[model samples]
Target: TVYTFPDEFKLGAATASYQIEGAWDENGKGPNIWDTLTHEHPDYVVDGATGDIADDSYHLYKEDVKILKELGAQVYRFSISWARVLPEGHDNIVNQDGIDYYNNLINELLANGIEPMVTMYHWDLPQALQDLGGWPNLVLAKYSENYARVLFKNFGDRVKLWLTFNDPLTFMDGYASEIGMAPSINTPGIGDYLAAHTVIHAHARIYHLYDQEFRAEQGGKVGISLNINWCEPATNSAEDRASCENYQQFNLGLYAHPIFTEEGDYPAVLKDRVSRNSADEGYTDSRLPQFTAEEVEYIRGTHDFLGINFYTALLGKSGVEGYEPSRYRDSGVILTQDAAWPISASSWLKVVPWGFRKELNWIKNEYNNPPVFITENGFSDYGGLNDTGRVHYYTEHLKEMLKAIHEDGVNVIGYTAWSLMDNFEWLRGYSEKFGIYAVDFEDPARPRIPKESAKVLAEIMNTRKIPERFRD
Candidate 1:
């Protein structure tokens, strides 16, 4: 089978600001939740590491752009740290150094013929705002819109594609779990739902700001990045299938339903289950928050496209048991992986390429075929230059994505590998390497060497097709 990509289909890479940029408190950069995390609880990271100077991308962004240029990347998807620019997270005073750093990065990418796709936020909330209750506080939503206005004013001219937020599903856990991530404030079911509610409003406000204020002048589009793993039933039984459906609805649909669906609210099952469980648990209000009808319409069609970060799959069954009165319990799906599937260096991430196709098809069917951008998808491993496992992972995943586009008719417009180079991996520290290019953490220079996976990805981007050997 010949697997050729569409001419307009794009290929590139993605990285979050806190995960890579790492000038944590340099040049008047105020503290973010991550800076507070690593500095205060260094032991929380397995390698006892902080991103204080992770990849030094703040200084070496030119090197990153050179790497993307050499690999023939058409786009570079990176996020802006809210605290970095809006030092206090309120847009009262803008950090010129932060703006200069990103302007340099964006200019470098464009000079190399790579378009810049910007994610407005990626888990690095300003500590100043977290002090005011973080994403759970509705006031931060308005603050975030104020911050986005600054972004549009500064970088909107060059960055054609703007993503409002990346993976609230994961970051909301930062509020719900003490061990989860930065500002890990053990609020469980309560904080998670409230944080999500705030984030949804923040995203819509940002999108509408872009739509009403900047779109005519900037000629850009705004969307959000959401990550989800496809779920399959653990058994052929009806209960098992329903469990998988619940996992999808509660996990992805919790966010997607509000923005992408016709109803413009949380999925029906999510609202019903959470409300019922709240009543049973003697709570006055549902664990999940409700959207006012005005909000429902305001958010219903806020996206220009859907940016998805797909990684792996899970097998689910009914009746989960962990953290009573939690999101997991609220969904009530027991998720596990097939023992036979090949595992990655990251314990939770297993190689399941077919899951990528299934997930893309699901998005297409569920959300009216909104143009989907594969924002982040890659494998993790112990540091290596050869990286045969990562090579295999990308080839398999890309093949599946191509099939999703060609045969399944999924509207996948572009794909970006998770990281152009390995930097920091949050709580895991530098232990898990997810980059196509290896970054030598031990080296003071933080030298980057292209792994075998990088070479393979370069070939795919240049050829505009999965090479003959990768095709079935």
Candidate 2:
């Protein structure tokens, strides 16, 4: 069977600003939390590698766009640095260089016939905002709304698709644990819960801003990018199966419920468990934040589409064996990956293409079939031009997604590969490469050479079909 995508379906690649752009403090660009973290606390970053000179995309926007055009990509899901455009974290002082850079990138994409998907925040918060209590404080929600206005004011004309936050589930950990991300404040369950509450609010305000102000005139759609991996039950028992449901509700559903569902609130299971655990732990108030009646109404029905970033799968069993007063304890899910699955360079990512289809079907059933954009998905490797492993990752994932659309009836609208080229991989740094095109970080030129995976993607895009070998 030949698997062909409809012409309307989109194909593309993705990269985050902090990961790719190297000019951390150039041309009126103020420092972000990542800049400050890598500069100040070299111990936090394993290789002491910083995004200060990651891919040098700041000076190589044209080259980046050319790579997308060459791949026959329809869209590019890239993130914007909050500190770059709004130097102080609020919209008080707009940076001219910041605006010019994105304007140039957006115009370049349009000229090359590639749609631009802008993620307003991708964990790179302005250091100033973090100074003012970061996501744990509610004020940042309003500040994020004001920043959205700046993005719309400058680039709304050419930029038609907007994502408010990329994987808040991942970034909320920046506060929950010490070693997770920059501004790694350790408040455990309490801090992470606070971070997520603000993130959910910030996402809603940004979406509502577009709906009220920009949608009619700009004709752009706004969504939030949430990342989740498929969680398979470790056994057939009710206890084990129930753990998988609880895991979903705790991680992805924590953010998705209020925005996507008709009943505008956190999942009852999440609310109940946290509320119970707080009492047991002798906390006066529940660590989880509760939305007011009016707030729920405002947040509900905010999304136009859902941006999903998926990578791997995990097996879950029923067990409450995490640290006391931690999120893992709250969920009581013990996760494992089958030893048989092939693992990627990233310790967490394993090859389980069948999990991709299961994950899509779960979303379809859970969310009543909202349009899903596969925002980020890729395999990591050390470094190579002849990347057979990366090529296999893309092919198998695409085949599963295709089956989800064709056989399972999941409403997946588009896809963008995880990265365009090798760049900073956060704490792990350049040691883990997810690029279809390898970047020579050793060279000052930061040259990008296409890998074997890049050629395979080009073939898929040019033909609008996965190879027949991938199909059943």
Candidate 3:
């Protein structure tokens, strides 16, 4: 079927502060965890590089809006740097210069006819706060509230969509623990869960704050964005199917169940397995944290909508005996990739169009079909001006999205591309590119040249046209 988006569907591109807005210490902006992590441990990064001067969006945000307009995007989803606004990440001091920067950027975007979707936090915690004890510390939740209040007091008037946190699961587990990101602790299961606990409550607090104080006047929606790669059962066997379900609950549903479900708590399967595993590991208490009755009530009905960041999918089966003790192993699932599936420049991503449909349908059936905004979705390439692979990926994935909307009747409201331009990609550094606009890192100008995919994406956004070639 030739697919088309609904009139109300928002098309946009997303970028985080640390990844693009370089000026790490400029304009009285305090140092963030990324600053210390990249400078202190350059070896952890792929090219021994840092985002100290990434796309220079701090000074060139006007240029970013121009690119977004050229790409035919109606909305520009970008994150605010907490450290930039509150240099010390506390309510004691407010950075006026930091506020001016975002005020100017928001005004520029508005001038260019692009609506702003502001993400309150995007993995860039102030180094000061990290030193005190980062997300794992419950104190950070209060700090998060303070920071969010400033944003609401200032930019909430102009911004309509507010995302409390972006991909906390990936940042907590993949970046902070296992992979290379700021505050690389490598604590695996324990560290990730503790951090998630604080983040969930932080998100809930901010949502309630906005709902009670800001929503009445500002008229905006607040939600948390999660990175949920669909998990497919490896086989028809009951064991494999159960494994897939377990992995899903542990990974994505852990966050979704509390906010989206009628009963605001962790998934029953997740709690049961984690408690059972803790017992087998000789721990008297379950590693997966429990929510208090009051906390559950606060967290429940906190989200105005669900924000999903989808890129790839995995096939899973039950893990083998004697597997190493890690977050994935703790979940008791063994994920594998299909060799037949097309790969990407990044080792982790694979082309799985049909999986997108399955994932949306699953969300509809599981979570009562909450309004979903695809906050981040894209393909990565080594580097190129001709990115037919990315073009193909966008086309195929969006076709499945259209199917979910039309056939499955999923309430998908917005779709934002993973990035607007190629900048620093965390530990991978500049090696992986997931942008329609090709950026020249070597150039002092940091010029943005449109790749072939940019034009295709612009065409898709402007016309909402599904090419005949993309049709089955």
Candidate 4:
């Protein structure tokens, strides 16, 4: 089953600013919601850890570039902290120091023959913006436009791929559900709906801004990254099949269908089911918001490429008639684990290689075969230099991705490992490690040492072929 990747395929590693860049509140950087959350609520995070000084990448980006070079990565996908450049989330007061830091990083990456894939927003909203109602407010759309414009103006010449938002569903649902992450609000159905609606508009406006104002001049691509977990029908029954489709539409198609598909404005099934669920809960109007005709047109065909973050899959079945009330039940589907599937260190991620191929084919068939970039995929393990588990995980996942591309004819253009090095794991903090390189948090230097997984990735990138052991 060993196969070589197409020569044009891109191999890269990813990192987020707030997760790695530890100079929070330094060099005129304004506080972000994460900074506020981690500081004020120690009990929310594991071991009371915070990203106040995670990896200090602000000072050690040069070392990171060297690591990328060693790994033979063609592209480096990293996010910019919204508060870093704007400080107060207003263009009126710019932070030149913050801009210079990213500029230096981008320049260093280019000098090392690496492409800079810039993600404009990656879950670190400015505390100042949060004070003004964050993503749920229509006002935030204008702010997002301004922020994206600033990035395109500053680094668009070199950063060719621009991701408008990284995984809106995770933040919109995670934050509102109050399970983990910042701006923790316990209102699930209503708050998530508002956030999801506003974020779609925000993304569409920013995309059109780049398309109309900057794309011709800058010659760059703009898109959003969606976090999608594959779902399969739990049984052969038609109800289970319909339930699985409904769940996929609810989780991924909610955001993706609006932009990537031809007739945009949320999936029809999603709209109908959410409206029915709302009526059942005694609401006159649907909890899910609606988009006008003009809005739908604006949102449609906004992406140059589709970025997907695939982690795991679940077996889905129709909810029982007298099911207990929960956010998941709104989709009329109940998702559960396949007991036969192997689990990873993180409780949520299951190791199912075939699911990766199934999901990619699903995207190709559903979205009319758009160019795809596997934005984030990696296995988590306890912090260790010898991470055999991660190496095995990557081997299996990459094999399926290759099968999708070479055998099934999926238009997969690139693959980015979930992270470069261990930093922060959000609510789990530093406990769940998903890095090829292990970061020593206890040390002031925060030294990074490559794991066996890193070596496997380096070999694959350098050779363009999977080693025999990996196939065996």
For TM-score, candidate 1 versus 4, the one ahead is 1
Misplaced by over 4 Å in model 4 are 320-327
Single out the weakest 10-residue window by summed lDDT for candidate 1: 317-326
Q: How many clashes does the backbone of model 4 have?
A: 0
Q: For candidate 3, lDDT tens digit of each residue in 41-107? A: 8988999989999999998898899999999899999999999999988978899998999999999
True-structure RMSD, every candidate:
0.9, 1.0, 1.4, 1.5
Model with the higher lDDT, candidate 2 or 4? 2
From the highest lDDT down, the ranking of the candidates is 2, 1, 3, 4
lDDT of 2 by residue, 274-317 (tens): 99999998999999999999999999999989999999999999
lDDT of 4 by residue, 1-472 (tens): 3389988889999999999999998989999989988999889998988999988999999999999999999999999998999999978888999899999999999999999999998999999988887777778888889988899889898888989999988888653556467888666777777888888989988998988888898898887899888888899999999888887888889899999999999999888877887788888888788999999999999899999998899998887332223346667788888989887878899998889999999899989999999889998887788888899889999999999998999999999998999989888899999999999998999898899999999999998988887785
TM-score of each: 0.99, 0.99, 0.98, 0.97
lDDT of each: 0.90, 0.91, 0.88, 0.88
Query: Which window of 10 residues has the lowest lDDT sum in candidate 3?
Result: 318-327
**Model 1 agreement with the true structure over 1-472: per-residue lDDT tens digits:** 3388898998999888988887888888989999999999987897789989999888788989989998899999998888889888888899999899999999888888999999989999999999998999999889988999999999998889999999999999998888778788999989989999999999999989988889999998888889999998888999998998899888899899999988889999899989998999999888888899999999899999999999999999978766768998889799899999998889889999999998888888899999999999999998878888898999999999888888988989999999899979989999999999889888878877899999999999998988988777
* CA deviation > 4 Å runs, candidate 2: none
Question: Candidate 3, after superposition: displacement of residue 235 in Å?
Answer: 1.1
